[PDB]
Design a protein around this ligand. Structure first.
Ligand SMILES: C/C1=C\[C@H](C)C[C@H](C)OC(=O)C[C@H](c2ccc(O)cc2)NC(=O)[C@@H](Cc2c(Br)[nH]c3ccccc23)N(C)C(=O)[C@H](C)NC(=O)[C@@H](C)C1
Ligand SMILES: Nc1ncnc2c1ncn2[C@@H]1O[C@H](COP(=O)(O)OP(=O)(O)O)[C@@H](O)[C@H]1O
Ligand SMILES: [Mg+2]
Lengths: 371, 749, 139
């Protein structure tokens, strides 16, 4: 038939039919419960809400993401998200449609196993496969060689690939991400005398992060300059039409990617973890990874992150050798688009795990076939 | 054995394929001793024995299957001695009517013969094209079902003459042409569809590149009502890319030849090598044809078939658009984007011919748009992608202009009155191979091979229904099935499917495509082979031949993808009526040309499997159009291409020769002792044949017909000829002795 | 052959000697054999002659003593009837068809030979009683 392609990270769920150019359903990966007494009789109380509805209702609700970093933490909530995905938004019965799922590399093994077990047992999915989110970005960006920086909510990781081969010894994984940029953004906003405590307020903070932040081509110059002048300031409206002024801080927040020390990590920023990934892989390869860097997932979209990396690698890198950084505007969706490609290759039809082989060999098969 | 003294065989020769000879000595278990109508020794190796010449009564009968030794030399010979000596041009094999095109026109199409066939049954006449129409038009009365006629050959071989007379026969049997004639209008349609349809291929000029089907409605009275057209299997790849010694579709040249004329002054047409789509073949002139005159005959054909010149000049405006679009030239600003230089001349003109503003076409040609559900991204594309999209736009324009011209040729032809039932007449190109083979040939070969599957299935069903009548078991007759090849080309993990995968897969290339072919099939399958000296090609076995396809251009030609926002720019144009029309009523924009072809092919066969087809084949008996000559190499190549020799090789495993007992006796009783011979004919032959032939597998007795396998009518007539010849010896010598005795009495005197 | 037979045969041989040297040609040997009651085929005659070449067949001469072993070698009904029944089934044979087969099959004869032997044997319809014609040619 034609095959479902689905992403869940700790941010937006991305799902659609394979062979489309963009996901047919996009909604935040949120499950929400009322925290107030139901007063009205005939209110039409509902035991939980999923996605966009929870975004409208959220004032009345409390909101919890079933996925933290890369990992599903609480499974029966997640199962509601899948149920909503297939039945409500796609409105397609999962019995007739092979399904494709994406994970971050170096995740716990249970996460992949239970994700299989649910799909076969609870949705009766005819066939399944699981793919690392980095790899798909190469199909999306049209390449078979490059070092893939992938960063969204949840996990941030570098995977190098050279002419179709991964290099498992050189996969690097990190956890600074849109969620922890968001918590930092709250903790810094507190210093201008504004505070957000509850989950629903956090999702106001996130919309600030998306709308106003940007990355400074050099950080101490703009830090000094914003003290020296208002002109960097900008202002934004809360839902109720109150207005807030935001400062030098609006660039200060995404700097934590380049300097993890601020959030309190000892780590080196995505530039240096890219370089340290290039080091682990041999000089046979290295020139062509320096020649291709591909960015995936939401956090990469901060305006000017690309130029800041091309500077901060090139100044770090060996001097003689061109450095190039490649940022399609799609890149928030590229991890899905590459699944739309991979699920529609004909060679891949051999590779689907199928119900028969699972029933023969148990869930354990998924590690053997998939990766 | 069969090979005695004074028996005849064929041998291979450089200038004609088989040559006749005679055995001077019997064979015995190496050298063979031969005489040539010079003397020769012909010598034998792994072990095999030559083709054995048929007895001489059978040569020249109406039907090649009547021959006992069915093989290439006999088919060659019997066609030759019809065509040159008899000047009979039509022949039967199975049901499959062969037609060998004379360039000399002939009486036999004349109207009397129409009346003479119209009542008669299939086998009762000398074969002729009216003998096919006679069946199709009878069958449509006798039973409900629609009937179709199928015509195959090189486009030089008289297909359209066969269709024209096929229609004439219907129009006269309907008695109705005076009431209205479609026939004039159908035949006056031909120049337009030739002009859009055809190209100059290496092995012949004015090759046609599309399957063309014409559907003719009847009254409940079965007079003609009207005619409807359809078309299938158009070659889109040619419009933008061409091999050396080929041209683009004829109109582009007939247009460029007219650049001098003030009628088209606006278009700024050049000489044909100016434009990047026309020049690539290096071959602007078709030998012996003026283009500039023929243009006028095209326009007049459009006028006669009812297009107002308001449309005709719009058509030519579009074509000039396609050419100026062709000359549009990109530059790379950086490896992952492209741009168009300022005031770039051809795009400047193109935007005026279309009446779409400059800036929109500039923007969308350089940029792709991706729309998600919530939001838009406008996205740059690399020079390669830009060129691929421009050429896909050109192909999509041309295919829509073609479908529109067919829609109007219908609109003129498509009288509307309730249509009781219909007969169909179809032209297609034959199986096709050259020194080079390429994606065009690959698709043409897949279309021929999947029609061949239908034909073989129908012939098998029709013999099974024949054996049904005479209570013969099925095990004797065996279906022959080329599903094993089609499952190679068509099915998933096919050659086409793996190509459509390489179109998607990033940094695809013809080399990696080929390497995936070899990985998939090469050891597995008997029909796929790697050519030894190269990794740039692959071989596929077919019914006719092994064929070697070059990878070299094969992925580039497969890509079709058209960006919606580019056609929307055209669709907005105010300036003239037609271009907003062409695009009127998606997912198809993604479909690669291979997939679009495989779909059009299944739509064709779903149009034919509704129907009970008849067949024609046309062969081009000399390469030079001599008024009469026959050239035995060319007739061989044509008889492979049409697949007649496979129809024969299939039937020669069969029971290809049948006799009615009362006809059988007239020759065979001479073998047969009257002293034994019974009162009851079927018992008579059952007794006698069991003596004359050793094995009960070789023959079958049926109610009215007796069946023989391939070899045994020849053997039976040989043993007749020996027995009769020996008796004739004994009489002749006895008479010579008697007269010599009388002469000796003269000596006594 | 005994002395009486040898004398009759020698007399016949001398009647065929057209040169006076007491010899006949090879090409006459068959004719003499037929005049003496033999009915050899042309193939049998050439075989007993040793498949002679044209030159010796037309000009080489042999006396009676060399001829005699050849006559002996050549010398050493239901088939005849069935052979005629081939061309029958009312017991007749077309004159045209018998003429055609005798002039076109086997060891083809001339039209004049066939006319000579067939003269007086066909009726008004042009039919030959083949049992009577056979008895006639066997007499
Ligand atoms: C006390 C410790 C561990 C744990 C509390 C001990 C328990 C016992 O381990 C589990 O089995 C629970 C669970 C888990 C969750 C789901 C599942 O199907 C299986 C296990 N995994 C987790 O909570 C992971 C998640 C994680 C972070 Br973030 N990045 C990672 C990178 C790779 C892999 C996984 C992760 N996690 C938060 C930790 O390890 C924290 C950082 N570890 C520690 O502070 C040290 C001192 C050891
Ligand atoms: N325009 C933007 N600028 C900066 N951050 C963004 C933007 N859009 C989304 N984000 C952030 O990206 C994160 C989602 O990352 P993404 O990779 O899209 O999720 P997933 O990993 O589930 O695909 C969220 O923190 C979201 O706030
Ligand atoms: Mg993601």
């Amino acid at each position: 038939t034609t095959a479902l392609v689905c992403d869940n990270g700790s941010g937006l769920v991305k799902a659609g039919f394979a062979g489309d150019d963009a996901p047919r359903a996009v909604f935040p990966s949120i499950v929400g419960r009322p925290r107030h007494q139901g007063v009205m009789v005939g209110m039409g109380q509902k035991d939980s809400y999923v996605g966009d509805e929870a975004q409208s209702k959220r004032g009345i609700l409390t909101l919890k993401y079933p996925i933290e970093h890369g990992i599903i933490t609480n499974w029966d909530d997640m199962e509601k998200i899948w149920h909503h995905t297939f039945y409500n938004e796609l409105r397609v019965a999962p019995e007739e449609h092979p399904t494709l799922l994406t994970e971050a590399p170096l995740n716990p093994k249970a996460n992949r196993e239970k994700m299989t077990q649910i799909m076969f047992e609870t949705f009766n999915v005819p066939a399944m496969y699981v793919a690392i989110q980095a790899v798909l970005s190469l199909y999306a960006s049209g390449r078979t060689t490059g070092i893939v920086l992938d960063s969204g909510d949840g996990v941030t990781h570098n995977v190098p690939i050279y002419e179709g081969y991964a290099l498992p010894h050189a996969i690097m994984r990190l956890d600074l991400a849109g969620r922890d940029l968001t918590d930092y953004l709250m903790k810094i906003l507190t210093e201008r005398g504004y505070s957000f405590v509850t989950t629903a307020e956090r999702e106001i903070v996130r919309d600030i992060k998306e709308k106003l932040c940007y990355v400074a081509l050099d950080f101490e110059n703009e830090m000094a300059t914003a003290a020296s002048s208002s002109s960097l300031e900008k202002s934004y409206e809360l839902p109720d039409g109150q207005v807030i002024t935001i400062g030098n801080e609006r660039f200060r927040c995404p700097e934590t990617l380049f300097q993890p020390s601020f959030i309190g990590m000892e780590s080196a920023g995505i530039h240096e973890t890219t370089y340290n990934s290039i080091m682990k892989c041999d000089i046979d390869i290295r020139k062509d990874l320096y020649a291709n860097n591909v960015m995936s997932g939401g956090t990469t979209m901060y305006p000017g992150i690309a130029d800041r990396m091309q500077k901060e690698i090139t100044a770090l890198a060996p001097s003689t050798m061109k450095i190039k950084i490649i940022a399609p505007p799609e890149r928030k969706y590229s991890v899905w688009i590459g699944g739309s490609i991979l699920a529609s290759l004909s060679t891949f039809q051999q590779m689907w795990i199928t119900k028969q082989e699972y029933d023969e060999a148990g869930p354990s098969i998924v590690h053997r076939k998939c990766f | 054995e069969l090979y005695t003294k004074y028996a005849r065989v064929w041998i291979p020769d450089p200038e004609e394929v088989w040559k006749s000879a005679e055995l001077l000595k019997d064979y015995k278990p190496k050298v063979l001793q031969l005489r040539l109508e010079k003397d020769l020794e012909y010598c034998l190796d792994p072990k095999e024995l030559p083709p054995l010449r048929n007895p001489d009564i059978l040569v020249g009968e109406n039907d090649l299957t009547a021959l006992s030794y069915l093989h290439e030399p006999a088919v060659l010979h019997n066609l030759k001695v019809r065509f040159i000596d008899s000047k009979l041009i039509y022949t039967y094999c199975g049901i499959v009517l062969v037609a060998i095109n004379p360039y000399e026109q002939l009486p036999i199409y004349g109207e009397d013969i129409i009346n003479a066939y119209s009542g008669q049954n299939m086998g009762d006449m000398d074969p002729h094209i009216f003998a096919v129409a006679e069946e199709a038009y009878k069958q449509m009365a006798r039973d409900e079902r629609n009937q179709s006629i199928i015509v195959s050959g090189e486009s030089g071989a008289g297909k359209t003459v066969s269709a024209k007379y096929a229609m004439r026969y219907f129009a006269t049997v309907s008695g109705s042409a005076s009431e209205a004639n479609v026939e004039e209008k159908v035949l006056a349609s031909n120049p337009i569809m030739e002009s859009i349809g055809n190209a100059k291929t290496t092995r012949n000029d004015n090759s046609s590149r599309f399957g063309k089907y014409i559907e003719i409605g009847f009254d409940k009275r079965y007079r003609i009502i009207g005619a409807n057209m359809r078309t299938y299997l158009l070659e889109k790849s040619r419009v933008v890319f061409q091999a050396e010694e080929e041209r683009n579709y004829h109109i582009f040249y007939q247009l460029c030849a007219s650049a001098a004329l003030p009628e088209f002054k606006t278009l700024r047409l050049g000489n044909a090598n100016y434009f990047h789509y026309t020049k690539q073949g290096g071959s602007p002139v078709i030998d012996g044809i003026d283009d500039a005159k023929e243009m006028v005959n095209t326009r007049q054909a459009c006028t006669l078939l009812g297009i107002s010149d308001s449309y005709q000049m719009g058509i030519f405006r579009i074509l000039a658009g396609i050419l100026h679009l062709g000359n549009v030239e990109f530059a790379s600003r950086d490896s992952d984007s492209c741009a168009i230089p300022p005031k770039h001349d051809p795009l400047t003109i193109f935007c005026d011919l279309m009446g779409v503003d400059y800036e929109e076409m500039a923007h969308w040609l350089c940029h792709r748009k991706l729309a998600t559900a919530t939001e838009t991204y406008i996205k740059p594309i690399s020079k390669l992608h830009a060129i691929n999209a421009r050429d896909a736009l050109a192909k999509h324009i041309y295919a829509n202009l073609f479908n529109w011209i067919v829609d109007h040729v219908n609109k003129a032809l498509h009288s509307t009155v309730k249509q009781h039932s219909f007969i169909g007449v179809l032209d297609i190109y034959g199986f096709e191979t050259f020194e080079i083979n390429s994606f065009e040939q690959f698709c043409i070969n897949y279309a021929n091979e999947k029609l061949q599957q239908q034909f073989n299935m129908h012939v098998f069903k029709l013999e099974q229904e024949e054996y049904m009548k005479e209570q013969i078991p099925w095990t004797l007759i065996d279906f022959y099935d080329n599903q094993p090849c089609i499952n190679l080309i068509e099915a998933k993990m096919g050659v086409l499917d793996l190509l459509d995968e390489e179109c998607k897969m990033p940094k695809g290339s013809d080399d990696t495509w080929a390497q995936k072919l070899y990985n998939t099939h090469l050891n597995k399958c008997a029909l796929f082979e790697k050519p030894r000296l190269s990794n740039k090609a692959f071989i596929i076995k077919h019914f006719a031949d092994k064929v070697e396809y070059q990878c070299e251009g094969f992925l580039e030609k497969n890509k079709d993808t058209v960006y919606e926002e580019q056609i929307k720019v055209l669709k907005s144009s105010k300036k003239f009526k037609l271009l907003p029309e062409l695009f009127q009523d998606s997912k198809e924009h993604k479909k690669t040309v291979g997939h679009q072809f495989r779909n059009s092919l299944h739509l064709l066969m779903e149009t034919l499997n509704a129907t009970t087809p008849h067949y024609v084949r046309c062969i081009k008996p000399n390469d030079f159009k001599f008024p009469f000559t026959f050239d035995e190499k060319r007739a061989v190549q044509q008889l492979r291409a049409c697949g007649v020799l496979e129809t024969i090789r299939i039937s020669a495993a069969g029971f290809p020769s049948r006799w009615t007992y009362q006809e059988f006796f007239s020759r065979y009783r001479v073998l047969m002792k009257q002293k034994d011979v019974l009162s009851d004919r079927k018992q008579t032959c059952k007794n006698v044949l069991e003596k004359l032939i050793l094995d009960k597998d070789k023959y079958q007795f049926g109610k009215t017909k007796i069946f023989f396998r391939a070899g045994q009518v020849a053997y039976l007539e040989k043993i007749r000829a020996d027995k009769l010849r020996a008796a004739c010896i004994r009489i002749q010598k006895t008479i010579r002795g008697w007269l010599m005795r009388k002469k000796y009495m003269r000596m006594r005197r | 052959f005994n002395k009486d037979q040898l004398e009759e045969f020698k007399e016949a041989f001398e009647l065929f000697d057209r040169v006076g040297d007491g010899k006949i040609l090879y090409s006459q040997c068959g004719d003499v054999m037929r005049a003496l009651g033999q009915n050899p085929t042309n193939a049998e005659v050439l075989k007993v002659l040793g498949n002679p070449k044209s030159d010796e067949l037309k000009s080489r001469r042999v006396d009676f003593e060399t001829f005699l072993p050849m006559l002996q070698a050549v010398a050493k009904y239901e088939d005849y009837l069935e052979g005629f029944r081939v061309f029958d089934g009312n017991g007749k044979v077309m004159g045209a068809e018998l003429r055609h087969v005798l002039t076109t099959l086997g060891e083809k004869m001339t039209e004049e030979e066939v006319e000579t032997v067939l003269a007086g044997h066909e009726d008004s319809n042009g039919c030959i009683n083949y049992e009577a014609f056979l008895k006639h040619i066997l007499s």
